[model samples]
Target: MMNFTLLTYLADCQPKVRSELEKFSKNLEEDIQQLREIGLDILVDGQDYRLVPMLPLLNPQQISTALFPYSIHYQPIISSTNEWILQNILSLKKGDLCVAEYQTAGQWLSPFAGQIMFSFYWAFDPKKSIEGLSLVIGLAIAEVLNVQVKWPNDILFDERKLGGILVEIANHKNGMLNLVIGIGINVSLSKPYAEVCEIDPDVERQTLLPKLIQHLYTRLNIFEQNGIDEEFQQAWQSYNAFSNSEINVLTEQGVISGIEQGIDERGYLKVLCGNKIQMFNGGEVSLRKK
Candidate 1:
């Protein structure tokens, strides 16, 4: 009942595989039918305003954006896209972006925030301290959004929480490690959440999401294989929030406050405490601007 001729003109993504168009069209038909299994219903030809089932147009085996490499794994709804990666860590490879429309237990900030949310699964061995791994991913994300970075993990806009990184690790082989880097941002913060002083965003989610995956994956490889090369550190140097300010890192032992020196070569936080500079451990780190 739909026209393929005009659709081809609209979709310049599949130029060589014109024959694949018929197959793709069929997949869309099936995708619409399965939408019901997730408590979503749609005609695919038009919008059903009442329920507003915002399903991602699936082009399996096709990287529509041309930015991402592998066939994206997407779901209409899931507990958390990143959580799914933990189960299928060995099956997925580099550049595989686990995506979902809505996540019931997505990111720590807020999941299902009316924007694109996904995680990139990468398989590699570590070269730097795994403790500061989130900072590296944060830098790559900030590069795409052109936003400022908060110490340790989160991204901030005028000190307001925009997004953050959540990294999960596992064993791939006897020597290899699998890391699924989870990233989420408030492209536009929906209601039912507090905090203000929103920094007007620098990039569109459509553009940022794809580029973020590609950029983060590339950066992760560099860090793993070469431990945060000079260029990587030099660029993200400016956004270290508490670098000049005092930082209070709460450890299991107790709270320690000091002037933030910077992150060291091994990616440890350099805190200029009372008499000397000290590096903090992972779980012992939490910074809140007062």
Candidate 2:
């Protein structure tokens, strides 16, 4: 295990806490220095050290959501929150959540300090096909964060990447389909990319987590009842980052360059390539703007 202790100010974030951190110990002082070098806001309180950004670890009492009934498993470090949910999917119920401070290896990207990394466990009816599920999830995130969404599952702000979504599905013998939706949102400001702190520096993951889950519950239920309704389509059209923009869709066969038309009812990307419009689904394909 890492040979360092982490602490946080219980009251509130203020200049007083910053002043107290300046008078901490030599060994602990060294730890805070090193953590700062790695781009983390480390604060010292004479006897303990804490990450200023990662303060007030997630707690069950803090989250006032009705969707997540199970215990919130908060970890300081983990390989991947999605993997943990998949391993315990048998016991994990809908709205079950797993959050981590730092991840060694995430599903699509590596973890970073002050980033919200979590996986939500949910099950779907076997009868409903999850065709546009990822797109809808992206829409939900865009709604909560007030950001734009790239096709498939990318969250963007001002053309810079802000976050992403990854969903893993497991079919059970009893006809139940379990889904582990892993989402990562950068809360700290980083170079060359947008983050949540850029939008609202005071936003904490503990409070933001529950709001995200709440929106997901609302959106997912609407999707389950009505697959990609007109309202969802309109909202998605407004949030589309590449709407009417030229892009190159890379597929297994080859690259197809075209202008974005929008998405169909099934959530496939419709690109106007030449005179005809070609559709692409969320499979072995990637997108790039020309």
Candidate 3:
């Protein structure tokens, strides 16, 4: 069994925020108990921080939302000591299903184990696009899991909408820039939100958040011993959402159709576009069913 601690904070939030936090916290506590049954040493922290704001501060962006705020911040204090923190910062308002952290130092930071800080925002109404949020979390999870994340829009589980991911950067107190990654997942959206979007609801959405956090933490530790490159590639292939499937890629030149081969080491989507293989990364290209 793995040894780990799961801490929750939601004391100072509004009444609605507290409710949601309690929901997740309670569920996580139950889940930890189950994990412990399997011989894992899991600890759950059910403290509230609704009154005392923690790291990153409560910006206007977080003040207006209805969904709960969640963050996991970790830094290496020394070779043997690592500082880990988790909190539900604030609630997100409507039409605001995304959050971002900036790495102002300029340039991207190379991937490292246990050095990821994540934040998220959720929309009151779920009809809005959540693809960005899902992608952000997916890629970050992929990186931490030692697998390459496919970009240019990768489909998960038979074109079922997974989630979205957005990442921003800013300079930290140190000379390095921090990569603030925000993820918005379609976690059991209301019927209206699903109907309006004309997409199948995530069958496993409710269980995704806690599972993601637990999985990510475990994977981060694994990455410390084994580099992220090879392991990530393998896991991604095994869990290919649309493995061997065909997809449509919208490009500036024209819309292109291709076979989803997978991603490269740097998380670029590799596709068999007709007779030629092509790669795409970044930008506003859409992935759709062919």
Candidate 4:
């Protein structure tokens, strides 16, 4: 029997004709029955890959109660999952997750191919600070991928760049903080320049996601309760891609040369520039190995 209900998303767009998403989901069962009755699946893309609406039930054993999120908004395709979350930020509850099968405009760079894109959101009081949030997220992702971080948010495998992290925040009039932490990772590639997961990248998404969320939640609990502890800081340093190597950082002020000294308390990169120690945040800049 043809499962007309399953969404066969396109690499380009969602529909050929007009349709309402809310109506489709709300009445999914009856909608699918109607589509099946009319052979609507054929009207979709002539592709084999399909994204099941929403997602599989999150493994309860994988997350803790304290860090449990509000909900997961899973999209088959989106211009940018971050933008989607931002669009709905006003109504978003604390710990909402926004993820997608493909990001048409993902901030997570894949030197070789498309990547897995997702965001984690948590609400805070307006006055609270996200001190080492990005760095901590990097550590969590690295632990799952068994990779390292280059200075700030790029996920690296050896010297090649594999993925990156982008974070955004919105302040509400009610003194609520909407913090969205997005992560992208390379699962497979054909190019030889960047490192990739084994030979099969397509299947890596299923295997990686569970563990990735596990690692993220574990660290997230520690982060929310204790803030940036000595343990988290030390872990970030250990995962530093340029631990002892010389590096060149590009900034609006031009290039700055330094040896990696690790990150400071406020989550800025610490670099030893000659006799001076300089701190830099990952803004208007890129990091490169010398």
Alpha-carbon lDDT, every model:
0.60, 0.74, 0.39, 0.62
**Clashing residue pairs, candidate 1?**
none
TM-score of 4: 0.70
Can you write out model 4's per-residue Cα lDDT over 14-77, one digit (the tens) per residue?
A: 3433244333345644555553453222233443222222223233233334235446676654
Ranking by lDDT: 2, 4, 1, 3
| Cα RMSD of predicted structure 1 | 9.3
Q: Candidate 1: where is the Cα deviation over 4 Å?
A: 1-49, 53-65, 106-113, 126-131, 171-175, 192-203
Per-residue accuracy of model 3 over 1-290 as CA lDDT, tens digit each = 21122212221222323344455555654654543453222333354322221122224323333223433232211111111111221322211222212111111221111012234322212232222333434644544333334454332333444344445432323233233334433322222111102233332322333445545444433443443366666666766655567888787787889898776654566789778778775564665548
- State the lDDT of candidate 1 residue by residue for 100-171, as single tens digits: 555655323232224557876776654435645787788887777667776678777666667756788755
Q: Which candidate tops TM-score?
A: 2
**C-alpha positional error of residue 6 in candidate 3 after TM-score superposition, expressed in Å:** 32
Best by lDDT: 2
On the 0 to 100 scale, the lDDT of residue 262 in model 4 is 80
Model 1 error, position 226 (Å): 3.5
